[PDB]
Nucleic acid binder design. Structure first.
Ligand SMILES: [Mg+2]
Ligand SMILES: [Zn+2]
Ligand SMILES: [Zn+2]
Lengths: 144, 392, 49, 1341, 49
DNA sequence: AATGTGCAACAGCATGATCGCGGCAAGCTGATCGTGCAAAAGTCGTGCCAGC
RNA sequence: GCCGCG
């Protein structure tokens, strides 16, 4: 299976090589709606895991109408995640890289914070190779 | 397309030379028979043969099931020998064998810091030859470059001192063979050791997927000012603590460190010392080390915690806590600002990574590095003190 | 006029030309009467086509 | 008697529990037997050289009336024995001398001969021979030849798993594989069409070959189908009744039996109606005309009125043709079954597809298909088809092929023609058809009844046969142009093709590889190896999951544990201990017969096929004294499965408990407590252990160590053991006892031990004697133990006091912490020997001379060189000191005055000649062991040559004079007895020499008969001694006939003692490996209450996640054994009286719960008991067989006897702080090995070196000063970091930028650390390579 | 590579060396990380002339 | 009601199938003739003057 | 081409 893993990671690296963070903020309103990953009778992915270190694309509303909890275009860190877990937020609209609409790259805000360091990502970080390596480092432990 | 040399003065024609010679032969024969008013069929046959030869030269293996020769193996034509595996894999495109590089077996050094590695003095003095030449020439020891080369060859004691000097703040970067992710190549400050095996800090092992059962690592020297700053500020083991795939810390205690931390922070119903009251962790360590109390004994200890509730300020609270001797001893290691509730458990490799994560998210980077080093030290020490063993 | 040639592809050894008519650094870019070899750095054996 | 002399010296405590029926075999039967069958004469041409010779000879010219008749052959005596042959570097081989004669026949008189020239033998070829250990010393190497596992020739049906067309339709294909030739394939098209594939070409309709065998359409339809008859008389149109065939069918109309209704229209189709119809005897009955509409006419009825007829086979019938045949008088019409219930429409479709129906048409079609060139002329197609199949020479499947062919088709006969007939193709086609219908089943291809083993003999025979046919094609030519003067040497003997083919196979082949030399275990494992690769085998990439898996028939034939790890897993295996080969070559395994309910002792060897039907018991089944089974319901294997069966149902029983595991894996004690993968790694790791300075027996063994040590051949084993007469560190001389003696010339046995000698892996091969003096020795005892052997018992490691505990992180992961006492006691110190060679070869400018005087080199370097220019024996060299001084001359003929001044001031050479001397390669050290200078015939002898030759003469005469002295002493004794019988002068007769002038004459009879015969015998003895000594001296001193260019060869040996160090790799035999981390001082290690410190500290965390409980059990058993040894050594220290020592040793040996070992010291006298106790002082070498060894209770009670804690754990005190560790620590004695992976050969570093001519990048690997490869993924990681400048310097300056390298070096030496990058040469090379195509690529601005 | 070069050779296209593998092959600073800053200086000069 | 067109199934062919590292032999194996003549170049046996 | 190492 190591040969298959190596070939897969080669393909991923080559498809994703030409992608670096080039802009501070594209300014788009587009985003991706995120909800806890649920199937059947058990919880699999809580919203805290799926939203941590991402930038909100729209204002999050408490079930009480017309109460702005966290403002638009902000980075969610452990404090924000804990605050939204204290309330009952269930779906959060956070911008993702598939809607950055910038040319030959990705906005530093559409892409969340880099997982290696707590701060938001800096311009010029080659994120395609990092993503390919992260996806391809496992696979040697996937039972095919 | 160099010619293969052989025994004596005889030379062996290589692949492309054979293909070119064949093409030239057929072209010359066709040219000579064109002017002889040869019949149409022989001219046609020679034209076909020339076309076939040119195709075999330009890309062998198709249209004629290869042309082979002298080994019953297809001949390596122009297309096949582009670059290694026909692409740019081997001798281009990130495939270069690099100079100023070495390789050796890795062993465990528990005395190291998080940013240090062990480099043999024989492996150095060979990676750092031009630097040592420069230092010898600049100190006035060897004026001519020949004198410096001879002095390094004879390896006097002054060469060793100068080598120790040039190593001082020059990070060298080690990597393991299957560099799966980016944490598989990291820059450490070398420490010269008398040996032949590279000594690797245990904590980083999980990043490398490296066990000390015959693994080998390669050492590269970043011989430039910009490269040195890049190794120090981008590839240092103190820089990449969290894995850039999920954000969870990747330099975490493993194996013996976890066993030591778990054995230290446990309790038993009856032990030496029960409900005894201690003025602080120092008294707990004194009681354990001198033998008047057990690591698992349950006591009441006066503990002072620090909170960062104020805006960037640490405020202290002192309280009497029901804990064990081992947890109190461990508390002398946690940096100020973390609650005592992170120690009042068993710390089974899930609490310890969580406590490192909270240290990173609350205190910063450098206190977390100091904390990780101290955790590894104390875990090894108390695992050895524990004497845990497997029996039938 | 061979596959390995000295009139083309440049010289074989340093600045020396075949037959040793002009073989030194004093002569440069000169083509011998006997052999069409020119005196140059013989690193052009990797470039002349 | 009960115990041999060598076993009496140290008796292991076997744990047994089950008597062994048959002992382990030779362990080398495969290679020795295969080569013996290949070489030895056979009066029937069954196998070997004689078989090939009878296959080829006799051969005659094309009606030339001249023949070569073959009569027997012979192999000459080898010129050099294996020792000298390995020393010089020549192949160990023997000549072939074949006796053949010419017969020239009469041209005028048919079948008559006119000339018969019977010349002597003619020489061709040089056949290598295998030594007594099963190795071919060729070109001065070892070169074991590995057995091959391939597909036995025959017929194989396959199902391709039924996923080809994604329609779910299963396609069955049959394949005929010859031993030598081209295969046949029959395949099914999902549209249900037969297809035939010859030589794996495109598919063709199958009926072409049937037409090619002179088979008409009617005949093939009759052969491949059964035919029924429809009778239409008086418009009745009756049908024959076949109730068996009418199983599933719908009644289209009323069915009446003899005018009475039997089955209604669409009535019940159950078996009851069929049985009722069959019970009633009913003749043919009328049937509706609608049913016959779908039928197809089989035969071709002929009209009696006109020649026109309906011969269209595979055609249906119309209403008009019914009237036509009625007019023609066709009362009965033959039509095939056309019934699809179990059968089906087949064959007819293929013939409908292809319209050819004539033999010539089929032959021309197949000739065009096979050969797409020129069409034939009735002669090329026929010859081509003859050459494919039913050809005596072009096609041949061997006897195993014919056997498999007959068995697959259930034919009673087994022996048959090794060539295809016309009927077997029909039979295999019908078998494919029937397996399609459902009768029969597809067979497994991995089954060991379908995989054969080719050993050395068969492959050598095949290569010799290839060479032989090649020589025959040549010798056939000349016979038409040869007169009566031609002789066999001139008969185109042509030794060159034969010798070239055999040497090419033996030296450079896929399955003839360097034999590993670490330990005797790795040797013995490599010798008995099964390889699935090879010429006629399969490649690594072309093998799927299924081929490299463990098939249920692998039980007692192929080891399930021992196999390489990464690429070759499952493709390389080792035979089990007991597996052998059939007469055909399939693997068989011993078993014990069961009669009634008892287990008898007769042993039957069962193959893979035969064992499938018998019910086979298990090795560990309890038995009573009478042999019956203790329990009624026992475990068994019936057909590739296992279950519980009754006591009277079984048919065979396992012979022993080592049947499953190989020789390598049967050495791991407590194997049953190890994970299968960890056991695999341990077995593969035992073979890499390096022999140590001193062998140390395993305290915990298995008992197979004696077998490995003895049958590996490294040791010296007696063959006519009597009483040892002389012992030396080099020789052992034994006087054979009188009970066995060859009459005449008396006889003694001399064993010359091989002293320090390099192995293939550059270890040391050393033999030291085991016997002292006057010690009786029996046949089969060991005299000297080779590398890593102790008293004839395999000892490839050392016993180390191992404590399982984490220690300050120094045994993190798998690292191993070692005490300084291990280094101090010189354990794990290994001697490594290296080769260096120098050649004095001729040159255009003159001859190369080896002289001590080397120009330009001073006296200091020449200090270690003698007057001949070669280093002194025992000189310690390192770095680059000169070993031999060789001088290369230079050509100078334009005599110039400056050279005159140079020649005048300095010597006559004036250092004109260059020097090219042998220097130690850098980084190598050692002491010179031996120098092996060889000289050419005619060239003057070197100074050291006379010394070496005189040493050889002195050794030869010293070794040969012993028998001379014995014989002369015997003759003198006989003469003394004779003179005592008459005229005895007592000591005076012994005072004078020559028996005091033969004691005059004395009596007439004694003088004429006794004295004369004694003198005659004495003078004949003197003469034979003189002549044999002269012959030996002439043999030793001669000029070697080396290569034409070379005039002198010099070989220098170096030896260096590598001591253990942190980087070194150490491992136990339970898969637990590691590298050392620290060499702790003695006082820092943990110690027990007795103050004795441990030697090795291991990590316990490596036990539970790896599942090696063999580790812990071996540790406890070693602790118990060392406890008993300590008790014995204590009772020996205080000089305790013998009887109590005997009683204690008896108590130790009488332990265990019903063990089969019954060693009793009552029969032992005092001396042997004292010797044994002194031998058990270090510990009791107790042994546990593989799967039935020591139990928990036995280990605990063994510990109890030695006054050790039964828990196996003691209290350990810290060596640095003195505090007791909180928990008890497991301490014992584990037997550890030092693998060949040392940091001395694995540390490398480079800063500048030599670069490749093209691409100008650094070379690769050590021994060439290479740089580490910055591969693709490394650059990916650097890009992920964002490291642009480091990446740029790694891509241009460090590697490929030609000017960037020099600029960067100058900047560093200056101290600038500036890059100044540039243009990699690799990209310029790529641009030139692309431009050399028809493509223009440039650099724009 | 046979297919990619063939379609590139016919179309007569150019690379412009914008990605990472293009710059690594020719030994230039990659446009990511510490080389990102250097690549921006070159881009503005190209636009300005 | 016979006819032409567009869509789909089956066969053949191209492509690629992890990264480093260490050690050992044997192939690595490799030739276009002669031609017979001027034309040139070189070489050899011989005689020359200049130094001791 | 073979063998092994992680
Ligand atoms: Mg490893
Ligand atoms: Zn964006
Ligand atoms: Zn010239």
């Amino acid at each position: 299976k190591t040969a298959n893993s190596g070939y897969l990671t080669r393909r991923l690296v080559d498809v994703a090589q030409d992608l670096v963070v080039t802009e501070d903020d594209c300014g788009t309103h587009e985003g991706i709606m995120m909800t806890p990953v649920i199937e059947g009778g058990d919880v699999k992915e809580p919203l805290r895991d799926r939203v941590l270190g991402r930038v909100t694309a729209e204002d999050v509303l408490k079930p009480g109408t017309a109460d702005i909890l966290v403002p638009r275009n902000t980075l969610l860190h452990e404090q924000w995640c804990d605050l939204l877990e204290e309330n009952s937020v269930d779906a959060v609209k956070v911008r993702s890289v598939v809607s950055c609409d910038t040319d030959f790259g990705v906005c530093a805000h559409c892409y969340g914070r880099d997982l290696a360091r707590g701060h938001i990502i800096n311009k010029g970080e080659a994120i395609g190779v990092i993503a390919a390596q992260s996806i391809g480092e496992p696979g040697t432990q996937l039972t095919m | 397309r160099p010619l293969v040399p052989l025994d004596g003065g005889r030379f062996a024609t290589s692949d492309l030379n054979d293909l070119y010679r064949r093409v030239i032969n057929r072209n010359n024969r066709l040219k000579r028979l064109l002017d002889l008013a040869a019949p149409d069929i022989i001219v046609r046959n020679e034209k076909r043969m020339l076309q076939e030869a040119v195709d075999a030269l330009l890309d062998n293996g198709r249209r004629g099931r290869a042309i082979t020769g002298s080994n019953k193996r297809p001949l390596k034509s122009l297309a096949d020998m582009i670059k290694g595996k026909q692409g740019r894999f081997r001798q281009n495109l990130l495939g270069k064998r690099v100079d100023y590089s070495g390789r050796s077996v890795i062993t465990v050094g528990p005395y190291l810091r998080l940013h240090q590695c062990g480099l043999p003095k024989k492996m150095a003095l060979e990676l750092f030859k031009p630097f040592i030449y420069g230092k010898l020439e600049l100190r006035g020891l060897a004026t001519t470059i020949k004198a410096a080369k001879k002095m390094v060859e004879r390896e006097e004691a002054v060469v060793w001192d100068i080598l120790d000097e040039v190593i001082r703040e020059h990070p060298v970067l080690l990597n393991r063979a299957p560099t799966l992710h980016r944490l598989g190549i990291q820059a450490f400050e070398p420490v010269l050791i008398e040996g032949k095996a590279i000594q690797l800090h245990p904590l980083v092992c999980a990043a490398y997927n490296a066990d000390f059962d015959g693994d080998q690592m390669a050492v590269h020297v970043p011989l430039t000012l910009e490269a040195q700053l890049e190794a120090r500020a981008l590839m240092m083991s103190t820089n990449n603590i969290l894995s850039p795939a999920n954000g969870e810390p990747i330099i975490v205690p493993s194996q013996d460190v976890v066993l030591g931390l778990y054995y230290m922070t446990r309790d038993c119903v009856n032990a030496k010392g029960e409900g005894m009251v201690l003025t602080g962790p120092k008294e707990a360590e004194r009681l354990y080390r001198s033998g008047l109390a057990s690591l698992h004994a349950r006591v009441k200890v006066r503990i002072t915690e620090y909170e960062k509730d104020a805006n960037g300020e640490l405020v202290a609270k002192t309280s009497l806590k029901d804990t064990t001797v081992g947890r109190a001893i461990l508390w002398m290691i946690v940096p100020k600002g973390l609650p005592y509730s992170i120690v009042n458990q068993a710390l089974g490799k899930k609490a310890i990574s969580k406590m490192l994560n909270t240290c990173y998210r609350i205190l910063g980077l450098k206190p977390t590095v100091i904390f990780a080093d101290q955790i590894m030290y104390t875990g090894f020490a108390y695992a050895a003190r524990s004497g845990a063993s497997v029996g039938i | 006029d061979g596959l390995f040639c000295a009139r083309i592809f440049g010289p074989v050894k340093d600045y020396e030309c075949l037959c040793g008519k002009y073989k030194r650094l004093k002569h440069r870019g000169v083509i011998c009467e006997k052999c069409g070899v020119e005196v140059t750095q013989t690193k052009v054996r990797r470039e002349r086509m | 008697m009960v115990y041999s002399y060598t076993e009496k010296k140290r008796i292991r405590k076997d744990f047994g529990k089950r008597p062994q029926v048959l002992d382990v075999p030779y362990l080398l039967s495969i290679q020795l037997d295969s080569f013996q069958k290949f070489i030895e004469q056979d009066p029937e041409g069954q196998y070997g050289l004689e078989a090939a010779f009878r296959s080829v000879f006799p051969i005659q010219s094309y009606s030339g009336n001249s023949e070569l008749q073959y009569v027997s052959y012979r192999l000459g005596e080898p010129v050099f024995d294996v020792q000298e042959c390995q020393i010089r570097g020549v192949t160990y081989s023997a000549p072939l001398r074949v006796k053949l004669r010419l017969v020239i026949y009469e041209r005028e008189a048919p079948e008559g001969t006119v000339k018969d020239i019977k010349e002597q033998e003619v020489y061709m070829g040089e056949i290598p021979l295998m030594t007594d250990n099963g190795t071919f010393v060729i070109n001065g190497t070892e070169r074991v030849i590995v057995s091959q596992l391939h597909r036995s020739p025959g017929v194989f049906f396959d199902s391709d798993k039924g996923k080809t067309h994604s329609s779910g339709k299963v396609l069955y294909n049959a394949r005929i594989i010859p031993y030598r030739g081209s295969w046949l394939d029959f395949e099914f098209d999902p549209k249900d069409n037969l297809f035939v594939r010859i030589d794996r070409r495109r598919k063709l309709p199958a009926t072409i070959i049937l037409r090619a065998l002179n088979y008409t359409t009617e005949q093939i339809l009759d052969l491949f189908f059964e035919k029924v008859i429809f009778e239409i008389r008086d418009n009745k149109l009756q049908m024959e009744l076949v109730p068996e065939r009418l199983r599933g069918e719908t009644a289209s109309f009323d069915i009446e039996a003899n005018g009475k209704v039997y089955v209604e229209k669409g009535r019940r189709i159950t078996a009851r109606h069929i049985r009722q119809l069959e019970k009633d005897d009913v003749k043919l009955i009328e049937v509706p005309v609608e049913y016959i509409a779908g039928k197809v006419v089989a035969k071709d009825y002929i009209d009696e009125s006109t020649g026109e007829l309906i011969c269209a086979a595979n055609m249906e019938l119309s209403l008009d043709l019914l009237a036509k045949l009625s007019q023609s008088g066709h009362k009965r019409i033959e039509t095939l079954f056309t019934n699809d219930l179990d059968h089906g429409p087949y064959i007819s479709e293929t013939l409908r597809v292809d319209p050819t129906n004539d033999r010539l048409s089929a032959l021309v079609e197949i000739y065009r298909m096979m050969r797409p060139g020129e069409p034939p002329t009735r002669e090329a197609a026929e010859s081509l088809f003859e050459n494919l199949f039913f050809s005596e020479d072009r096609y041949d499947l061997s006897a195993v092929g014919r056997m498999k062919f007959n068995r697959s088709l259930l034919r009673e006969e087994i022996e048959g023609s090794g060539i295809l007939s016309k009927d077997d193709i029909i039979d295999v086609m019908k078998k494919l058809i029937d397996i399609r219908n459902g009768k029969g089943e597809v067979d497994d291809i991995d089954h060991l009844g379908n995989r054969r083993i080719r050993s050395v003999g068969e492959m050598a025979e095949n290569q010799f046969r290839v060479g032989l046919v090649r020589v025959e094609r040549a010798v056939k030519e000349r016979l038409s142009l040869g007169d009566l003067d031609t002789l066999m040497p001139q008969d185109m003997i042509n030794a060159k093709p034969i010798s070239a083919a055999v040497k090419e196979f033996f030296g450079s082949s896929q399955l003839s590889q360097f034999m590993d030399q670490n330990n005797p275990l790795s040797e013995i494992t490599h010798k008995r190896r099964i390889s699935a690769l090879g010429p006629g085998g399969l490649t690594r990439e072309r093998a799927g999951f299924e081929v490299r898996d463990v098939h249920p028939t692998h039980y007692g034939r192929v080891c399930p544990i021992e196999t390489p790890e990464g690429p070759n897993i499952g493709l390389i295996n080792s035979l089990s201990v007991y597996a052998q080969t059939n007469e055909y070559g399939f693997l068989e395994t011993p078993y014990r017969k069961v009669t009634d309910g008892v287990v008898t002792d007769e042993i039957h060897y069962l193959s893979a096929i035969e064992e499938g039907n018998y019910v086979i018991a298990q090795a560990n089944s309890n038995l009573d004294e009478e042999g019956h089974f203790v329990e009624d319901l026992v475990t068994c294997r019936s057909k590739g499965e296992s279950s519980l069966f009754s006591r009277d149902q079984v048919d065979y029983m396992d012979v022993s408990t080592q049947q499953v595991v190989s020789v390598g894996a049967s050495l791991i004690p407590f194997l049953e407590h190890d994970d299968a993968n960890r056991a695999l790694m341990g077995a593969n790791m035992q073979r890499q252990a390096v022999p140590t300075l001193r062998a140390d027996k395993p305290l915990v063994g298995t008992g197979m160590e004696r077998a490995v040590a003895v049958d590996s051949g490294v040791t010296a084993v007696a063959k006519r053991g009597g009483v040892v007469q002389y012992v030396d560190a080099s020789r052992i001389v034994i006087k054979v006892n009188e009970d066995e003696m060859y009459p005449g010339e008396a006889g003694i046995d001399i064993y010359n031990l091989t002293k320090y000698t390099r192995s293939n892996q550059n270890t040391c091969i050393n033999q030291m004697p085991c016997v002292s003096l006057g010690e009786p020795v029996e046949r089969g005892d060991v005299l000297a133990d080779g590398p890593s052997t102790d008293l004839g018992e395999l000892a490839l490691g050392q016993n180390m006091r191992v404590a399982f505990m984490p220690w300050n992180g120094y045994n993190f992961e798998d690292s191993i912490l070692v005490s300084e006492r291990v280094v101090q006691e010189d354990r794990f110190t290994t001697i490594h020997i290296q080769e260096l060679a120098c050649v004095s070869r001729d040159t255009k400018l003159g001859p190369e001379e080896i002289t001590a005087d080397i120009p330009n080199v001073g006296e200091a370097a020449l200090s270690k060189l003698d007057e001949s220019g070669i280093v002194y024996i025992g000189a310690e060299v390192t770095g680059g000191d000169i070993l031999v001084g060789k001088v290369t001359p230079k050509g100078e003929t334009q005599l110039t005055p400056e050279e005159k001044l140079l020649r005048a001031i300095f010597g006559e050479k004036a250092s004109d000649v260059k020097d090219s001397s042998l220097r130690v390669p850098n980084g190598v050290s050692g002491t010179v062991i031996d120098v092996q200078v060889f000289t050419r015939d005619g060239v003057e002898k070197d100074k050291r040559a006379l010394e070496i030759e005189e040493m050889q003469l002195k050794q030869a005469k010293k070794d040969l004079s012993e028998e001379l002295q014995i014989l002369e002493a015997g003759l003198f004794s006989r003469i003394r007895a004779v003179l005592v019988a008459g005229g005895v002068e007592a000591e005076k007769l012994d005072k004078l020499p020559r028996d005091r002038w033969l004691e005059l004459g004395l009596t007439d009879e004694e003088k004429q008969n006794q004295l004369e015969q004694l003198a005659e015998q004495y003078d004949e003895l003197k003469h034979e001694f003189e002549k044999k000594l002269e012959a030996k001296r002439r043999k030793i001193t001669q000029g070697d006939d080396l290569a034409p260019g070379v005039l002198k060869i010099v070989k220098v040996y170096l030896a260096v003692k590598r001591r253990i160090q942190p980087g070194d790799k150490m491992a136990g035999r339970h898969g637990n490996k590691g590298v050392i981390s620290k060499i702790n001082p003695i006082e820092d290690m943990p110690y027990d209450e007795n103050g004795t410190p441990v030697d090795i500290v291991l990590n316990p965390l490596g036990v539970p996640s790896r599942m090696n409980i063999g580790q812990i059990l071996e540790t406890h058993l070693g602790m118990a054994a060392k406890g008993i040894g300590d008790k014995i050594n204590a009772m020996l220290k205080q000089q305790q009286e013998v009887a109590k020592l005997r009683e204690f040793i008896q108590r130790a040996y009488d332990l265990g719960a019903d063990v089969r070992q019954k060693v009793d010291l009552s029969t032992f006298s005092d001396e042997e008991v004292m010797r044994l106790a002194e031998n058990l002082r270090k510990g009791m070498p107790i042994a546990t067989p593989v799967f039935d060894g020591a139990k928990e209770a036995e280990i605990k009670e063994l510990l109890k006897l030695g006054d050790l804690p039964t828990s196996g754990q003691i209290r350990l005190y810290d060596g640095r702080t003195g505090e007791q560790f909180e928990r008890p620590v497991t301490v014992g004695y584990m037997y550890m090995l030092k693998l060949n992976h040392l940091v001395d050969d694995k540390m490398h570093a480079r800063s500048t070196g030599s670069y490749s001519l093209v691409t100008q990048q650094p070379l690769g690997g050590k021994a060439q000063f290479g740089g580490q490869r910055f591969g693709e993924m490394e650059v990916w990681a650097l890009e992920a970091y964002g490291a642009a400048y480091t990446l740029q310097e790694m891509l241009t300056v460090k590697s490929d930028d030609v000017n960037g390298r020099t600029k960067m070096y100058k900047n560093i030496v200056d101290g600038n650390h500036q890059m100044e990058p540039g243009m990699p040469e690799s990209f310029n090379v790529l641009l030139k390579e692309i431009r050399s195509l028809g493509i223009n690529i440039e650099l724009e601005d | 590579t046979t297919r990619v070069l063939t379609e590139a050779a016919v179309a007569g296209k150019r690379d412009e060396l914008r990605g990472l593998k293009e710059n690594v092959i020719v030994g230039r600073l990659i446009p990511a990380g510490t080389g990102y800053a250097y690549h921006q200086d070159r881009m503005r000069r190209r636009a300005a002339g």
